[model samples]
Structure formats: structure tokens, C-alpha cells
Target chain A: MMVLYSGTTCPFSQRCRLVLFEKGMDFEIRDVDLFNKPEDIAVMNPYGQVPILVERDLILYESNIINEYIDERFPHPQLMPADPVQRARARLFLLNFEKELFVHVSTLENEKGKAAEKSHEKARLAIRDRLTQLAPIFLKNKYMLGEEFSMLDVAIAPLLWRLDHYGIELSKNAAPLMKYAERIFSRPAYIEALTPSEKVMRRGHHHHHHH
Target chain B: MMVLYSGTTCPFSQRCRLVLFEKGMDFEIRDVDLFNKPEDIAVMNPYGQVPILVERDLILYESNIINEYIDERFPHPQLMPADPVQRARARLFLLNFEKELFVHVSTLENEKGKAAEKSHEKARLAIRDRLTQLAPIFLKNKYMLGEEFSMLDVAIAPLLWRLDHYGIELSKNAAPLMKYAERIFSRPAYIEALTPSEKVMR
Candidate 1:
């Protein structure tokens, strides 16, 4: 049995969990405390990062790689597209999310009072700009890649899950994007894996250290 | 005709060039100045990033994705390994280089004064430490993955070339790795692609 060493609220860990759920794979979940990290998880991943997957003997870290391995090893309800062009599109979306979405959001995590509030506004505007640029190409028949829920969905969904804790609201400008987000977030597999926890409110923000 | 929109002295672009050279593919290399990027490239890649590959009608951005496409399309002298596990290994190494090495090096660029000089010291030491960690698992024979040149080689070789610009050096931390890098760097493809131009400034 494959064992997934993960933290429930981490977007990276959530991406891996979503991949497992979508693929309909059976695995044991071990939630790791990021602050007082367990030795077993640390030993498995020298980087001391979470979302490490142990498939019998072989160990894998890095969320994207783990997701790729799962998609490759068990191909069902495909996470990545079969067509080369479409696959490139999916990968591009993931890259945009990482380079744009995550980067901007994380930048707002460390401010206080008015400063924190300003950073939050900046992040929201940045995300809105990205959504405006991307929504035309990415939004179609209910998914990022038209109808089929792929890895892009898994990668993008968790970002919305953590925004409220930072006193940031998804404005009407963001509502269209949130509509697409909610569609994927409503998935039974995603719901089963993602039961709202304290860590969601606490781990990802600038000052909340994981415990 | 394929048009490769790239930038001079970009590690990602260099990775693409290495793949093209290994496969012996003929294509137009349209070099873009990263600082003052061309409008055409900006149109192709919304992010306005370099190392964008366009073949006939197929347009792809992102260095790793482009490399994968090139390897898939032309599999003669395969850039990636045939075995699934080995392919994963190659990608893992490439990802580490992206997420760790690049991130650390970038931190050095923004430092000030003595901290700036000290940044280089820290970066080199960090790179050396990571390379030492990687050598045992990645290096076995002359190449990064036993015999035959692979994608990992293509992805990494360009980074060392960049280090040369900064006057950073790779020593005999692991004798095999040093020798392996030397062997690959000596290739005619690497030599041709890495043509030093005084006009190009780092």
C-alpha cells in the first residue's frame, strides 16, 4: 500500500491528495506537523518538505512530480491531456498559477494593520489581473480545459480555499473565476480529501507557523 | 520552418538549444533581449518569457515542457531515458535545479555590498553541497545517468556555462561529476551553441 505523508491544509499536499482521489487510488494519509516535523518524513525527503509518497520501497517528493508519477502509473480519468498541445496548455496553466498566483498571495502574508491590508489589496488585484488574462483561454464548458477536470483544477482549486483567512475577499471581479473554482471544489473526491481544518486558516498565511 | 524565440544567456533557452543540437534538428533561433523583449514573442507567450518554441502551428512555452516536446517528436538520440523510473529521476534532478539552485542563485543577485560578495560565496557553497548530494544518485558512469547523453545533461550543462560568466567554478567535489561535465561541455554542439560574444552582457 502506498503511504502519502502529507499535511491536510498544504496546497501542495492537497494537490497530491486530489490526484490520488481523481485516479481512484487507495493510499494511507499521514498528516505531518510542519513545525515539529517527524523524522520519518524528514528522512524520506532530505529537503524536509511534505507531500512525500512512499510506494513500497521507492520514495517521491515534490508535489508536481508525485502527481506526474501517479498520472503515469495509474492512467484513469486522466489528470493531464493526451494531446501534446492540450497537455502544454494544462502545464502552462499550472506554471502560471505557480509563477503568478502563489507568488502574489505569499507576498501579502507578512504585513500588519494598514500594511497587511494594502498587501492584501495588491494580491487581490494581481490575482484579478491574472484571471482576466487567463479566463478567456482557460474557462470553457465547466473546467480549465473544457469539461474534463485535469491537474490544472487540482493545482488551482486550493488557492481559493485559503484566501479568506487573510481578510481577503474574492470580489465580483473574481466571482467568475470562483464559479469555476467552486465547480471543481464541489467534487466528491475533493470534498472527501478536503475537510476544512484549523490548519487551512493558519498554515499558509505569512505569520501562522504550522504546528 | 520552426521559429525558436529565445534570449541570449538564458539557462532555459540553452536547454532547448542542447536538445535541438542532440537531435540534429534545424530551426531558426530568434534571439530576444530579455530586458527589452520583442513584441512578437510577447504576443506568443502571454507571460513574455523566453525559450518559446514554435513548429509549424504548434507553439509551446516553458523550458521543460519544450524540451519534453522536442524529445517526444524526435526520439533518435533520446534526450530522456526510456525507462519510466529513470525518466522520473531525470525530471526530479531538473526540478531540483529549477526549485533549489535557481532560487538560491537569484537570492544572491539582490544582495548588497559585502553581503553581495558573501552571496556568491554562499551560492557556490550551496551549489557544491547540492551537487555533492546529487552525485552519488545521479552519476554512475561518464554521463549523469550511466552511458549516453540524456535530458538531465541538456538541462544542467547550460547552468554551468552561465556560472562561467559570473566567474564561478565547479571543482572536483566528485571526480566523476567533474569529468562528466567536462566530457559533455567538450561536445561540438555545446561549443557551437555556447559561442561567446563580447556584445552579450550578463
Candidate 2:
């Protein structure tokens, strides 16, 4: 059996969970407390990040890497594209999502200070601009890859869900993107994948602290 | 046919070139002047980096991403592993190489100053320690994934070849890694892949 060492609220961990549920597979998910991680996390992943996948002897880290492995292991509904050209293109989009979008998402997740205040705004603005630039794509296509819920959608869905929690407000120009986000949210797998902490992230969703 | 915009001495570009030649397929190589890149480079790659692979309308950058595409497009030798488990493991190793080794390689390739000098030394040391740590694996295995010359070998060969150029010396413990590098260098395809500038890089 495959074991996933996931974080309760970590967006990266959520990516793996979304895929595992979409595949509808038999596996175990151990939600690790990111605040106080287990000692084995350090041994499992040198960086000590959650969303580590271990099946017997094979241990893997990095959310995209882990998810790709799962998609290959149980390739139902095929999160990645089928053709070599499309697969290559999908890989490039994944890389761009890291360099362009998630780099700021990391900042929003971690830093806090007077100095970081400027960076927080900067991170938010960068993310807003890049995502809005992508808004036009969703205007025509059902998903990021056109009528297909691909790894690209899975990769970006967490950030879209956390827009309220992250304090990122999209413009009227990005209305279609919000519609697209709702499309992903409507998926049964997506809802089942969410943790309680993640459920309260949206503005109108249930909200509480240390309940 | 495919067109690859490559850099003569750029280590990252050399990675793509290595895989291209290894496959022995019909492809065009357009050596880009990295110092003063043509304007299309900006359009071709957002970062304005080579090697960009163009086939018809498909444009791809990033060395590992480019190499994997080529391997899949041409599976005769099959640079990446055949099994899914091994393929995922290869991806992790490729990612670690970027974070650990090539991050430093980028530093050496560009950047120079009094403050940068300290970083240069730091980069070299990080590379040395990591390479030395992996020396024992080479003692037992022929290639990176053992026996077969897979994508991992294609990925790291340029760096191994340029240790002399980069001014980093491996410890005596790293002797086996040097032997492994020589094994890659001696391949005829590796020889064909070298640009005139890359020939002098060693």
C-alpha cells in the first residue's frame, strides 16, 4: 500500500491529495502537523517538507513529482496529457507555475515582518498580474488545458481556493477564472480532498479557530 | 526536423546537445550568442535562456524538460528508465541536481565581484561535497542509474566534463566519479556533440 505523509493545510500537500482522490485508489493518507513535524519527515525528506510519498522502500518528495508518480501508478482519468508534445507542453506549464505563481505562494505561506510587508504586497501583485494574464484562457476553455482537468488544474486549484485566505482579489477581468475555479470546486474528488482547515479558507465558508 | 538554439560553452545547453547526439537523430543546431542573444530568444523563452527546442510550433525550454521530450520522442536507446518507479526516482534526482549542483553552476557561469567571490567559493564547496558524497555509488555502479547510460548521466555529464574549467578539484575519494566521467567522455556521440567552444571547455 502507498502511504502519503501530507500536511493538513499545506497547498502542496493538497495537490497530491486532490490527485489521489481523483484516481479513486486504495491508499492511506497520514496528515502530518506542519507546525511540529515528526522526526521521520527529516529522514524521509531532507528539506523536511510534507507531501512525501512512501510505498515500502520507495520514498519520494516534491508535490509534482509525487503526483506524477501516482498518475503513472494508477493512470485512470490521466491527469497528464497523452501525446508527447502535449506532455512536454504540460511539463513546461508546471515549471512556469512554479517560477511565476507558486514562488509568491511560498512567500505568502511563510514570511511575516515589517520588511516582509513590502514583499507581501509585491507577492500579491505579482500573483494577481500573472493569474489575470491567464484569465483569458479560462474564458474560452473549460479548464487550463481546454475541456480537460489536467495536472495544471490540479496544481493551481489550491491557490485559487485560498484566494480569500491569501487576501488576493481578482479583478472583473478575471471573472471567468472564478467561474473556472468553481468548476474544479464542484468536483466530488476536490471536496473530498479538502482538510477542515482548508474548508474554512474561503470568505463565505465556515470559519473558526482551534475548534 | 527539430531546431535547438544552443550555447557553445553553456553547461545547460550542453545537456540538450548531449541527448540530441546520443539519439543520433536528424536535428538542426543553431548556436546562439549568449552574450548578446537575438530578440527571438526573448519570445522563444520567457527567461531568455537556451537551449530552446523548436519542432513545428512546439517550443520547449529547461534542459531536463527538453531532454525528456527528446528521449520519449526517440525511444531507441531510451535515455530515461523504462519502469514507472525508476522514472519517478529519476525525476527526483534531476530536481535535486538543480537545487544542489546546478544552482551553483549558474553562479560560476555568471556573476563576479568581491561579494560574488565568496559566493563562488561557497558554490564550489557545495558542489565538491555533494560530488564526493556520491563517489561511492560510482565505485559499485557504472552509470547514474547503474549499468545503463540513462538521462541522469546525460544530465550531469557536462558538469563532470567542466570540473577543470570551473576550478573545482575532487578529493581522492572522488576518483571513481572521474573514471565514470571518462566513460561518458569516451563515447563517440559525446565527441560529436561538442561545439568548438565546448571542445576547449575541458
Candidate 3:
């Protein structure tokens, strides 16, 4: 059985969990505390980050790497398309989403003091600019690439939920992106992976409206 | 013909230059002032980053992605090993080197004010730790992997030279990695690329 060392609240951790669920693989989930990481997880990722994956004796760290390994190893329900160039394009999209878009959303959450509100607005605008640039390239039919909901969706979904709570709704800023998120969120694996735990925090994503 | 919007000194740009030379491809090199980047390069990479490749009709940004594209287009003098797992291993190692090791070196360069001394010390420790981690995995036979110099050496060689100039001699901390770099530096492409540009900084 595959064991996932994860923290539900961590966007990085959630990225891996979402991919596993989308693959429909039944694996052991070991939810770890981010505040005080366990020794075993530390051994797996010396940086003391999650989610790390252990399939029998094989140990893998780095959420994206782990996700790629899972998709490659378990090929029944394909997360990436078969074409190599298309796959590279998908990776480029995913990298931009992680490093540029989602990172800005996280930065907004970490800001504080008198500058908090100002910085928050700046982050929101930056995010909007990124979304504007990305929306044209993203999947308009159903996902980020095409009709198939691949690893790109798995990588992008959880961050949408996190961003939603941070007063940055994808639907509000980029309608197509919202549709993209809605399609993936409807998946059973995504629903299972998104289940809120004690350690998980969704910021301002309560009920009824944006802050 | 491919056109590379680059800076002569930037390590990332040097990677692309090395790849082009190693592949023996005819390409035009357009040097750009990184701080005062040209408007056209901005169209290719909005972030004003170096090493943007313009091939026929396709414009590609990101150093690693560009290198991968080059590898695909030119099959000869393969940059990555044929096996998928080994390719993945190479990528993973390169990612570690870029993100963790190079990031620490930047911290030292950017250190200032009250914590300047402390930051320098911490950065030194960080560099040492990274070298220690990289030493065993590095092959002594010439390149980062073994035998032939691949994309890994192209990416690392310029950066290691900068670290050496900055008074962080990696040889004392990680002898094997230094030796590996020495072997790579002896290559014709590396030697040609090593010549200082007409306009010097610092």
C-alpha cells in the first residue's frame, strides 16, 4: 500500500493528495503536524515539508515530483496526456501556476500590520494580472489543457479553494478559471482530498460572500 | 536560425549559450542589459529574465524548459541520459542545485546591515551543507552524472566559477564536486565561454 505523509492545510501537501485521489488509488494517509514535524517525515524530506510519499521501499519528496511518480507508476486513470510536447506544455503551465499565481495568493495571507491591507490589495492585483495572462492559455472546454482533467487540474484545484478563502475568488476574477475549478472540484477524488481536517485552515472561505 | 536574448555573465544565459555551442548549432546571440532589458525581450519574457530563445516561430522562456526543447530538437550529443528514470534523477538533482544551493549563495550576496555578518556566516554554512549533500552523488569521472558532460554541467559550471571568484572555494568544502567542475571547465565550449566580456561589471 502507498502511504502519503501529508498536512491537509498545506497547499503543497494538498497538491499531492489531490493527485492521488484523482488517480482513484486507495492509499494510507498519515496527516502530519506542520508545527512539529515527525522524525520519519523529516527523514523522507530533510527540509521537513510535506507531502512525502512512500510506496513500499521507494521514498519520494517534493510534491510535484511525487505527483509525477504516482501518475507514471499508476497509469490506469491517466493524469497526463500521452504526447510528449503536450506533456511539456502542461508542465510549463503547472510551474507558472505554482511559482507565480498561487505564491502571490499565499503572500497575501502572510502579510500583517498597517501594511497588511495595502499589500493584500497589491497581491490581489498581481494575481489578477497573472490570471489574465494564464486564462487565454488555460483549458476552456473542461480543464487547464483540454477535455481531459489531467495532472494540471490535480495541481491547480486545492489552491483555488485556498485562494477563494483569501478574498480572491477565481470565478470573480477569471470566469473560465472558475469553470475549470468547478469541473475538477466535482470529482470524487477532489472531494475526498479536500475534506477539512483540524490542521487545515481555509482562511476567509466561510459561507455566503467574499471579504 | 535561433536567436538567444541573453546576458554574457548570467549563469542561466550561459547555460543556453553552452547548450547551443555543444550542439554545434548556428545561432545569433543578442546580449541584453539585464537591469535595463530591451522591449523585445520583454515581449518574449515579461519577467525580464535572461535566456529567452526565439526559434523559427516559437518563443520559449525559462532556462530549463528551453534546454529541454533544445535537447528534443537536436538529438545528437544528448544532454540527458536515454533512460526515463535517470533523466528524472538528473532533473531532480538539478532542481536541488538550483533552488537550495544557488538560493543560499544569493543570500550571501544580498546580505547587509545589522545582520550582515550573521547572514554571511549562515550563508557559508548553507553553501557548505549543500556542497556536502552534492559531493557523493557527483561523479569524479568528469561530469555531474558520469563520463560525458550533460545539461547538468552546462547549468552548474558558470555558477561555480562565480562562487570561486566570490571567495567561496568549493574545493575545500566538497573536493569531489570541485574536481567534477574542474573536468567540465576544461572543455572547449567552457573555455571559449569563460572569456570576460568587453564591458565588465564590479
Candidate 4:
């Protein structure tokens, strides 16, 4: 069995939670305090972060790493691809997601005082623009990598879920992206993975289908 | 056939080069100008960096991504571990190397003038301490992940070879690490992978 140290509302931690549910595995999720982090958080992870996965003596930090590990361990409903080329492409896209969008998401998480407002606006705009730019892809494909749900969808779902909570308004051009988000939101495992804190994240997101 | 755009002496570029040789694959290596980069370098890769891999229509940048792609495509003498557990571990270790050691290496590569000396010295020490602290692992393990040479070894080999040119000296405890470097240096593929410019880079 695997023990996961997670953050209640952390998008990164939420990533791991969704992955675990997808695998339908035996794992324990311990919600840690992001405000007052436990001492072991620093010891287990040099970054002092949540979403630590401990499987016996093997301790792993980083949500994607743990997600991949679980996917590999339980191969049915594989999140990653079987082809080497597709997997490599998947790997690169996941990394770019971190560099471009998620790094900005961190600004909203850590910034304080007037700096909060300063960084918040910047991050909100950053997220909005990227999602708007990314909207066109969903017009053609059911998921990020064609119709079948894959790791790319798993990686981006939490941020899409957090849009209203973070006050990011996607461009009206992004209606297809909202439909895609709704598709993911309706998945049984996705609904099951949400923490109580996460369900409040979205009131309602709209879609205008007129061309 | 694959084409690789590589920097003459970039450590990251050197990584893909080493992996290519290790596989003994048919590929063309183009030496890209680091100072005045080609336009397609930016067009192909948003970062305007090498090494970039082109296999027909597919264009891939980021050395590690390219290296892993090659490894997956050619599993003969697989550089990455086959086990899922080991592969996940390797992925995490590679990311840590980027954050811990290579980020400082970037300072040395980019900074200039008075800022050069300041950042250079800071980077020099930063590289120094990490390698020194990292030295003890070499005492027991033949390579980064023990006995067999793996991607971790290939990834760090460029850095170890560059310490001399970078003006970083190791603590005495790092002698085992030096020996470890010699072992990697002695590899046939590692030797063949060194470009004329890269050989002189040391």
C-alpha cells in the first residue's frame, strides 16, 4: 500500500489524488496543512512540499512522478501512452505545462500583501491567456491526445477546475475548452477524486455555442 | 535517419550526443553556433537552444527529452531503466539534477563582465559544494545508480568533464568521484561522442 501526504486544496496534490482514483488502488491520502506545514514535510522533501508518496521505504515527492508511478504499477486504463513516440511527446507536453502555466499558478499560492494583488493579476492574466490560446485544440479532439483520456488531460484538469476559484475568465473563444473541461468534470473517477474543499471551486462555467 | 542540432560545447547538447553514440545509431549532428544562433533554431525550439532532434517532420528540443526519446526508440543498451519503479526514480533524479546543479551551470554560461566574476565565482562554489557532497555516492556505486552505467551517469558526465574548464576544484574527498569520472571517460561511446570542439572544451 502507498501512503500519500497531500494538501487539501493543492492542485498538484489534487493531481495525485485524481491519478490514484483512476488506478483504483489501495492508498491512504493524508491532508497536510499548507499554512502550518508539518516538520516531516521539510525532511521528506527538500522543497518542504505536500504530495509526498511513501511506498514502504521508497519515498517519492513531486505529483507527476507519483502519478506516473501509479499508472505504471496499474496499467489498465493507462494514462500515458504505449508507443514510445507518443509517450515522449506526452512527457514533453507535461513539462511545458509546468514551465508555462503552473509556474504562474504558484505566484497566486505564495504571494502576500500588496504583492499578492500584484502577482495575482499577473498570474490570473497569464492563466487566462494560455487557456484561451490553448482553446483551439479542443475544437477537434475529445481529449488533449485524441479522443481517449491520457496523462495530458490528467495534468491540466485541476487547473481548469480551479478557474473560477482563482478568478480566471477564459475568453469566449474558449467555449470548446469549457466543454472539454465539463467532459472531464463529469467523469466518475474525477468526481470521486475531488476533496470537499475542491467542490466549492466552481459555481458554474458557461458555454456559448453559436458560431 | 535523424538530425540533431547541437552546440559545440553545451553540456546539455553533449548529453544527446553521448546517448546517440551509446546506441551506435545512424544520425547527422549539426554544430549550431551558440553566439549567433540560426533562425530555425528559434523556429524549431522556442527556447532557442540545442540539442534539437528532427526525425522527418517531428521536431523535438530539450536534450533530456531527446535522449529519453532515443533511449525508448533504441532499447538496445537501454540507457534508461526498464522497470517502472526505476524509471520513475530516474525521472525524478534527472529533474533534481536540473534544479540543484545545472541551474548554476547556466550562470557560468550566460553571465558576462563584472557580473561574470560575481556570478561565476558564486556558480563555481555552488557547483563545488554539490559535487563534493555528491562525492560519497561514488565511493560505493560504480555509477550514479550503481554498477551498470545508466542515464544518470550520462547526464552528469558532461559536468564532471567541464570542472577543469569551469575553474572549479573538488575537495579531497571527491577523489573517488574523480575516479568515477575516469571510468565514464574511458567508455568507448563517451570518447567517440566528443566533438573536436568538445574535446578541446576540456
Q: Highest DockQ among the candidates is held by which one?
A: 2
TM for every model, in the order presented, reads: 0.82, 0.94, 0.78, 0.93
Error of 4 at A54 (Å): 1.5
Residue B8, candidate 3: alpha-carbon lDDT: 73
Supply candidate 3's per-residue lDDT for B44.
Answer: 79
lDDT of 1 by residue, B105-171 (tens): 5555445577578777887778767767665644557677777788777877765555555566665
- DockQ in order: 0.48, 0.87, 0.26, 0.71
lDDT of 1 by residue, A101-120 (tens): 87775566334576567677
The candidates, ranked best first by DockQ, are: 2, 4, 1, 3
> 1 or 3, which is superior by DockQ?
1
lDDT against true structure, model 4: 0.88
Here the TM-score of candidate 3's chain B is 0.83
User: Hey, what RMSD does candidate 2 come out at?
Assistant: 2.8
Give the per-residue Cα lDDT of candidate 1 at A126: 82
Query: What is candidate 4's CA lDDT for residue A152?
Result: 90
Candidate 2 clash pair list: none
Error of 2 at B35 (Å): 5.8
Docking verdict class for candidate 2: high
Q: After superposition, how far is residue A150 of candidate 3 from its true place, in Å?
A: 3.3
Model 4's CAPRI class? medium
**Residue-level lDDT for A207 in candidate 3:** 37
